[PDB]
Every structure is written in structure tokens, then in C-alpha cells.
Amino acid sequence: RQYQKIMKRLIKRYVLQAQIDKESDEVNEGELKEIKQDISSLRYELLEEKSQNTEDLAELIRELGEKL
Amino acid sequence: DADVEWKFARAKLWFSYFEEGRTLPVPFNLVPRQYQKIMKRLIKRYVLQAQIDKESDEVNEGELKEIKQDISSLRYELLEEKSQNTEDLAELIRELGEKL
Amino acid sequence: ELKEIKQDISSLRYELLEEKSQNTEDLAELIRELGEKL
Amino acid sequence: LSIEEERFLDAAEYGNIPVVRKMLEECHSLNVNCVDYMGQNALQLAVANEHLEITELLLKKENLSRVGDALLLAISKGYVRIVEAILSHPAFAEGKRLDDFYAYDEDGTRFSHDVTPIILAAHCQEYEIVHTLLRKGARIERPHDYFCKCNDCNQKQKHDSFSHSRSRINAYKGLASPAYLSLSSEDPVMTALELSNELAVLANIEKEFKNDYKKLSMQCKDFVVGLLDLCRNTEEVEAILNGDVETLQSGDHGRPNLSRLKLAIKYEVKKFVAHPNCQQQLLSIWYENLSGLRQQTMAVKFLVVLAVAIGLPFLALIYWFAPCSKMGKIMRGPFM
Amino acid sequence: MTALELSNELAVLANIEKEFKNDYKKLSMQCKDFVVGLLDLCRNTEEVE
Numbered sequence: 381r382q383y384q385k386i387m388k389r390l391i392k393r394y395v396l397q398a399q400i401d402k403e404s405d406e407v408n409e410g411e412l413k414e415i416k417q418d419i420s421s422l423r424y425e426l427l428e429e430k431s432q433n434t435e436d437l438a439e440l441i442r443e444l445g446e447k448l
Numbered sequence: 449d450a451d452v453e454w455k456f457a458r459a460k461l462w463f464s465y466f467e468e469g470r471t472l473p474v475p476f477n478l479v480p481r482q483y484q485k486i487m488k489r490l491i492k493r494y495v496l497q498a499q500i501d502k503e504s505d506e507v508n509e510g511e512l513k514e515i516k517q518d519i520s521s522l523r524y525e526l527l528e529e530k531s532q533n534t535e536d537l538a539e540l541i542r543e544l545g546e547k548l
Numbered sequence: 549e550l551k552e553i554k555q556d557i558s559s560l561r562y563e564l565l566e567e568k569s570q571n572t573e574d575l576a577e578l579i580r581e582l583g584e585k586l
Numbered sequence: 587l588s589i590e591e592e593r594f595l596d597a598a599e600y601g602n603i604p605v606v607r608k609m610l611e612e613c614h615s616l617n618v619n620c621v622d623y624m625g626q627n628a629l630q631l632a633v634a635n636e637h638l639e640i641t642e643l644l645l646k647k648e649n650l651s652r653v654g655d656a657l658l659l660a661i662s663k664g665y666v667r668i669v670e671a672i673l674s675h676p677a678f679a680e681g682k683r684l685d686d687f688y689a690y691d692e693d694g695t696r697f698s699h700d701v702t703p704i705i706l707a708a709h710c711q712e713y714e715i716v717h718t719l720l721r722k723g724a725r726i727e728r729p730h731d732y733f734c735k736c737n738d739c740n741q742k743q744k745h746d747s748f749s750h751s752r753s754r755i756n757a758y759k760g761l762a763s764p765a766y767l768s769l770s771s772e773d774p775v776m777t778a779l780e781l782s783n784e785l786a787v788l789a790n791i792e793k794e795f796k797n798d799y800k801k802l803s804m805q806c807k808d809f810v811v812g813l814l815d816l817c818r819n820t821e822e823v824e825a826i827l828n829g830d831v832e833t834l835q836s837g838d839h840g841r842p843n844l845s846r847l848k849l850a851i852k853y854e855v856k857k858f859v860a861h862p863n864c865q866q867q868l869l870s871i872w873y874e875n876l877s878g879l880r881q882q883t884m885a886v887k888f889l890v891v892l893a894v895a896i897g898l899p900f901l902a903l904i905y906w907f908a909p910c911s912k913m914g915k916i917m918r919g920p921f922m
Numbered sequence: 923m924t925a926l927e928l929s930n931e932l933a934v935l936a937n938i939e940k941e942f943k944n945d946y947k948k949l950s951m952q953c954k955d956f957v958v959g960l961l962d963l964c965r966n967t968e969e970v971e
């Protein structure tokens with residue numbers, strides 16, 4: 381079954397080269413926007429995260445202040 | 449490339465007369481380590497200019513993805529980092545609450 | 549140009565990771581002093 | 587696949603550094619060599635997406651396979667930091683750039699089996715990577731003559747002639763690249779000219795790869811022309827055009843030793859000779875002792891030819907009687 | 923083998939379907955391009971054969 385082995389070897393090599401050629405295509409406006417949207421979502425995640433971190437934290441310190 | 453082709457032909461014509469050779473025409477010919485320093489300077493200048501020209505190439509889909517993957521990894525690093533920061537912190541406050 | 553943008557992300561990563569690491573180090577030191585006081 | 591292995595591959599592909607670190611430090615059953623649908627393990631996925639932090643964590647593992655293929659993939663994509671990190675691996679101690687070390691799966695290698703890291707870096711003309719590999723002793727092997735009948739060449743011809751010819755063109759594609767030419771030899775302009783001639787010869791000898799060798803010899807011509815295009819003063823122009831004037835013999839009667847320019851004309855560089863920097867030097871030699879006649883229009887030069895034609899016997903008489911004279915010096919000029 | 927046979931089938935359908943002749947000629951050219959590109963990746967005589 382050397383023919384089946386060689387065909388699998390060449391098919392995989394074709395898939396890798398086909399994806400490389402697709403990566404060699406020029407970037408468009410749609411792709412750059414998907415990247416822009418990534419930054420936009422990261423901003424919402426991080427700003428809420430740190431705001432939540434301090435709100436829970438300051439509540440614990442508020443309990444500490446009440447205990448005195 | 450016609451301009452380059454002619455200038456090479458003219459230059460080949462010039463080198464015919466560069467030799468000391470014959471001065472009289474047809475009727476009358478019957479009768480009797482700075483170099484190493486400069487090369488290093490130019491090689492470095494070539495490398496810098498070659499990299500500038502490579503930077504002048506249009507961006508492709510592969511390069512933009514490597515940038516996209518950077519943002520993706522940064523998101524995982526920062527979200528875990530802040531989550532770890534509060535988990536260790538709240539554990540310390542939990543110990544403080546137990547101490548009272 | 550895309551590299552200058554990539555370098556921006558790279559510097560932002562170093563600034564934020566050190567920042568949060570510094571935030572907890574100073575914080576945990578204060579809690580360590582609190583634990584010593586008991 | 588497996589849930590644990592699928593999660594590990596997904597985290598290693600998408601830069602999830604904390605999760606891959608935790609799994610490396612806490613699983614003890616997940617094997618680092620698990621591969622995805624395309625047969626790419628964690629290291630190849632991390633390198634392909636340029637995850638330096640994950641790459642270093644994986645490289646600290648001992649039983650990590652596909653490390654040499656990971657180096658080859660990192661080289662082919664640029665990724666200087668990842669390339670240096672992989673070169674830090676103990677498998678590349680003192681050099682591995684001269685079996686199955688560069689295989690990217692069970693059967694086969696990602697690139698041609700003869701393409702070593704130095705050849706691959708030269709192909710992509712990564713100046714940073716080529717400089718790094720050259721500093722560690724990596725060199726392209728300078729393949730033997732086409733009609734070489736030695737034992738080593740003969741064995742390659744019998745085993746596979748198709749792969750042997752493709753290995754020869756791969757080596758020449760590495761030597762002819764500007765990145766390797768400028769960083770490997772002390773005299774890139776001299777090397778580029780000689781390699782340009784050699785590839786031009788091989789284009790005629792190898793009819794099958796005639797287009798490839800003509801393309802590579804054009805690269806060497808382009809490099810030498812581009813190297814001449816960067817010169818800014820007469821001293822740098824002479825260093826590219828004439829060569830090492832200190833060790834050159836001289837040019838006859840005060841000329842700038844046209845030996846390298848004669849070699850360029852023989853090799854038909856056609857753009858190095860036709861360059862304005864080169865044309866300026868030859869024009870000065872052309873109008874050697876006739877400074878005023880360069881600026882005159884073509885009509886004046888036509889009248890000069892007619893005047894010389896009428897006074898041609900007188901000029902011949904002057905040359906016989908007074909060879910070393912004002913007119914004798916002018917007549918010996920190439921334009922005269 | 924599949925690309926060759928599908929290339930022939932689409933070439934036949936280009937003549938039969940005059941309305942979609944340009945489409946079927948374009949698709950049969952894709953199958954030809956795939957088979958040529960698959961042959962272009964071969965590195966040794968065993969893969970070429």
C-alpha cells in the first residue's frame with residue numbers, strides 16, 4: 381500500500397501549501413475589522429474585570445472598616 | 449530594457465578604444481585596508497536598505513494573523529493575571545476575616 | 549506599518565503584566581505587614 | 587483525539603499561556619507529542635502562530651518531538667525571537683545546520699530533505715536569521731560540477747536523479763540570495779559576479795532547470811547593481827567598480843584599473859555597466875584628455891570629425907614625428 | 923483520479939449547457955489547476971510516479 385501512503389503524504393503537503401498561499405493573500409477591510417473588534421472586546425473585558433476587582437475588594441475593606 | 453541594452457553596447461564600444469592598441473587609422477597603419485573598511489560600510493548599508501525594502505512590501509493575511517494571535521494571547525495572559533490577583537487577595541482577606 | 553502596530557501591542561503587554569505584578573507585590577507586602585500585626 | 591489533549595492543543599495554538607503552563611506542570615499523563623487533525627503537536631502550533639512564551643515553556647520539556655521541524659518552520663516564517671529560542675535548545679548545541687531530525691510527521695519532512703536551516707534562511711532572505719546561523723558556522727555546501735563523476739555524486743544519481751537535481755537548485759537558490767551573498771563573503775561584489783557567471787553557464791548545461799538558473803544568475807546581477815546603487819561618493823564608487831585599488835596593479839596611463847569592469851562586460855551584467863555611477867567613470871576615461879569636447883553639442887562633434895578627416899594626413903604626420911607631445915597625448919585618447 | 927474525471931465531466935457540461943458554459947469551463951479549469959498543483963509538489967521520483 382505504498383501508493384496510499386504516498387497519496388496521504390502528498391495530500392497533506394497540498395493542504396499545508398494551499399493554506400500558505402491563502403495566507404499570502406493581501407489583507408482586506410473585513411479582516412482588519414475582525415482584528416479591530418478583537419481589541420474592542422478586550423477593552424470591555426479588561427475594564428469590567430478591573431472594575432469588578434476593586435468593587436469586591438473595597439466591599440471587603442468596608443467590612444473591615446465596620447469591624448474596626 | 450532598451451536603454452540598458454544600448455548603454456551596454458556603447459560601453460563595449462568604448463572598451464575597444466581603451467586599449468593602447470592602434471592610434472593611426474586604416475590608410476596609415478600600413479606604414480611602419482581602506483577597501484575592507486569601505487566594503488563593510490557598503491555591506492551594512494545594503495542590509496539596512498534591503499530590510500527597508502522588505503518593510504515596504506504590502507501586508508498579507510498571514511502577517512495580520514500573527515498580529516491577531518498576539519492580541520489573543522495577551523487576552524489570556526491579562527484575564528488570568530487579574531483573576532489570579534483577586535483570588536490570592538481574597539484568600540488573604542478571608543484569613544483576615546477569620547482572624548477578626 | 550503593521551509592525552509598528554505589532555510593536556505597540558508588544559510594549560503594552562510588558563507594561564500591563566509588570567503593572568499588575570507590581571500591584572499585587574506591594575499589596576501582598578501590606579497584607580503581610582497586617583498578618584504580622586495580627 | 588482526547589478531551590485533555592484537545593484542550594492542550596487548543597490552548598497551545600491560541601496563545602493560552604496560563605492553561606498550557608498549568609497542564610505542563612500538573613497533568614503527568616498528557617503527552618506533549620499529541621497532534622491535531624493536521625499532525626501538528628503543541629510545539630508546531632505554538633511556532634506557527636508565533637507564541638514565543640508558549641514556545642519557551644514547551645522547549646523546556648525534555649521529550650518534546652518535532653523540535654528541528656519547529657526550527658525550520660520558525661525560520662521559514664521569520665519569527666526571529668522564536669528562532670533564537672529554538673536555537674537555544676540543546677539539540678542545536680554547537681550546530682545542527684550542516685536523519686529524520688527535521689521530519690514534521692511520521693513519514694516526510696516539511697521542506698525538501700536537503701534544505702538545512704542555513705539554506706532555508708537564505709531562501710527567505712532573513713538577514714537576522716542568516717547572520718545568526720552564519721555566526722554559528724552554518725554554510726551552504728557549494729554543490730559540485732554538473733558532470734562530476736565522483737562516488738558521492740554518482741550514488742545520489744543512482745538513488746534518485748529527480749531529488750539530486752532538486753537538491754542542486756536548492757543549494758544555488760541559497761547561495762545566490764542577497765542575504766547570504768552580503769553576509770558570508772568579504773567581497774560580495776566579486777562573489778556575485780563569479781556566481782552569476784557560474785549560474786549562467788549551468789543554465790545552458792541544464793536544459794531542464796534553465797529557467798531556474800537564469801533566474802538565479804539574474805539575482806546575482808541584481809545584487810551587484812543594487813550594491814553599486816548605494817554608493818554616495820567617488821571613493822565608494824571606485825571600491826565597487828574597480829575593486830581594491832591598493833592591491834590592484836594600476837590602470838594604464840592613470841586610468842582606474844578597469845579589470846573588474848572588463849569582467850562585468852564579459853559576464854553581461856548589463857545593468858552594473860549601464861548604471862549612471864559606472865557610466866560616469868567610463869565617460870571620464872572616454873574623453874580622457876579632451877575636457878572641453880564633452881560639453882559640445884553633436885553638431886560640433888560632427889564638424890570635428892570632418893575637420894579630422896581633412897587634416898588626417900597632418901595628424902598621422904604629427905604622430906610619427908612627435909609621439910610624446912601635446913597632440914600625441916590627445917590623439918592617444920580613446921575618443922580621438 | 924477524481925479531479926481528472928470531474929474535469930472531463932464539467933468540460934462536457936460546458937458544451938451541453940450554453941447558459942452556464944463560462945461557469946462550467948471555469949470549474950473544469952479548477953480541477954485541472956488542482957491536479958497540476960498536486961503534481962508540482964512532488965519531490966522525488968516515487969512521488970512523481
Ligand SMILES: N#Cc1ccc(O[C@@H]2c3ccccc3C[C@H]2N2CCC[C@@H](N)C2)c(Cl)c1
Pocket residue numbers: 464465466467469470471
Ligand atoms: N583602438 C581601436 C579601434 C579602432 C577601430 C575599431 O573598429 C573598426 C572601425 C572603426 C570605425 C569604423 C569602422 C570600423 C570597423 C572596425 N574594424 C576593426 C578591426 C576588425 C574589423 N572587423 C572591424 C575598434 Cl572596435 C577599435
Ligand SMILES: [Ca+2]
Pocket residue numbers: 405406407408411509
Ligand atoms: Ca484576505
Ligand SMILES: [Ca+2]
Pocket residue numbers: 505506507508511
Ligand atoms: Ca508581507
Ligand SMILES: [Ca+2]
Pocket residue numbers: 517518521635636637638
Ligand atoms: Ca507573539
Ligand SMILES: [Zn+2]
Pocket residue numbers: 730731734735736737738739740
Ligand atoms: Zn560529487
